[PDB]
Design a protein around this ligand. Structure first.
Ligand code: PRO
Ligand code: PRO
Ligand SMILES: [O]
Ligand SMILES: [O]
Ligand SMILES: [O]
Ligand SMILES: [O]
Lengths: 264, 264
């Protein structure tokens, strides 16, 4: 395994200022293909962990608990050291999901901050968490990229429209916690909007509290993302306020260590 | 009135190669405001010429036949000379519409070529026509811009999926003539995708045969377009194959002359 990867000090500053950062070409084509094959197996076999958009498969959750490939992936030397660097802690996986947007398909995903769900549904005490979204496909202007407000995370958590009982609607557009509208307007007047792009195999890191949204893929090309949410071990969720199963909100808080090279 | 405007030879070549061209800041703010006020009056008073998206007003058609402001606009020295230059003819207005996409609203508009409707529904014999879309608001990445395939018009008209009887569904997403999918894929593999941007008051010229599409406005800002379709007088539609009213497909083929300056 290559000496553990870390972000330069410019990259860190950029991440902290903006709330997101892209690293291009972290994984190669062959690596990505292995991940897409496994994603396809998880979509086939994940049962109640799958989510469907009038639709074929949209999301699958919790895969690192069931898939040896994905269990390894979260420990990768390409990912785990950066998670540790940005969270300034040992880390574990709170949540793992795979979100596809097939060619000419997709939905408008309502503007929202991931930490609002994790705090209220799972008992996350602070927003000392982030997500790594691995691009299974090139992310362009036209296949529904994640779209952020740069610097929007500095609001902390934002008072939010609630819709629904339990958690079923946390995985749908339509979302339980959405940002409706003066909120967004001022945000965007103050801060703007950016949809980071990148080639297949890139990684997009983003803050637990950054607002984000995405639109439909009007391209003839897919937009598959594998999203790993790392949380600080010190920031472990309070399992006594927890409302969701292990494959949405982890309860094993053992600090993660990196994969090492073996002959198999 | 300023000496009639025309496109430079680079601008022309760009238009003909790509199929579209933006001129920034053609109209000033005060001019645009006059146009938005009138658009709002037309949406209020246009009756059967209006179209609504579960929605408030999306489109209004034919306005230059009913509004003195819009009747003047199509004769403007900012527009008419360029229409004449690009069509290499005297011109008239085939079609006039206003398409709004309010903040956080909008639809996916299916990929399509305008000339397919005009040929089959209206009797336009050749694609020697174009549209001028005046930006009532800044057009960005995020408020559902018109999205093209650059050079896509060089296919000529493209064999197309038909859905519906009569014309009601020519003004909706969902559209009578859409480009489904190998079509789009190869197009886009060959040619790519571009969503031209620009400030309020710009003009986007595009070819009657360019493929285009747009997605929803996830911005808190509107995207109002006033679209004037100029046709070559020599290319006048064959009114004997005509199926739609005058406010969708004009029948008065009198060549247009430019507004001149008067004291009122
Ligand atoms: O429910 C959750 O935990 C994730 C976070 C944003 C939307 N779905
Ligand atoms: O029906 C028409 O004439 C216009 C052209 C594209 C969609 N609507
Ligand atoms: O999200
Ligand atoms: O999410
Ligand atoms: O169009
Ligand atoms: O159109």
């Amino acid at each position: 395994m290559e000496p553990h990867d870390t972000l330069s000090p410019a990259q860190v500053d950029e991440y902290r200022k903006n709330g997101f950062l892209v690293q291009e070409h972290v994984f190669d084509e062959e690596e990505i293909e292995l991940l897409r094959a496994e994603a396809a197996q998880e979509f086939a076999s994940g049962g109640e962990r799958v989510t469907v958009e009038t639709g074929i498969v949209r999301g699958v959750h919790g895969c690192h608990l069931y898939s040896e490939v994905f269990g390894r992936l979260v420990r990768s030397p390409r990912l785990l050291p950066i998670a540790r660097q940005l969270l300034r802690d040992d880390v574990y996986v709170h949540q793992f999901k795979i979100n596809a947007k097939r060619a000419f398909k997709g939905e408008v995903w309502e503007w929202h901050q991931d930490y609002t769900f994790w705090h209220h549904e799972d008992g996350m005490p602070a927003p000392r968490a982030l997500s790594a979204a691995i691009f299974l496909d090139e992310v362009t202007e036209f296949n529904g990229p994640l779209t952020f407000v740069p610097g929007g995370h500095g609001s902390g958590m934002i008072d939010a429209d609630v819709k629904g009982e339990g958690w079923a609607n946390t995985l749908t557009a339509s979302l339980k916690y959405s940002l409706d509208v003066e909120t967004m307007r001022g945000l965007i007047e103050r801060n703007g909007m950016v949809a980071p792009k990148g080639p297949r195999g890139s990684v997009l890191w983003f803050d637990a509290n950054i607002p984000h949204s995405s639109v439909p893929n009007i391209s003839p090309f897919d937009r598959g993302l594998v999203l790993i949410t790392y949380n600080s071990v010190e920031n472990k969720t309070d399992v006594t306020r927890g409302t969701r199963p292990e494959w949405l909100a982890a309860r094993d808080f053992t600090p993660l260590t990196a994969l090492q090279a073996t002959s198999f």
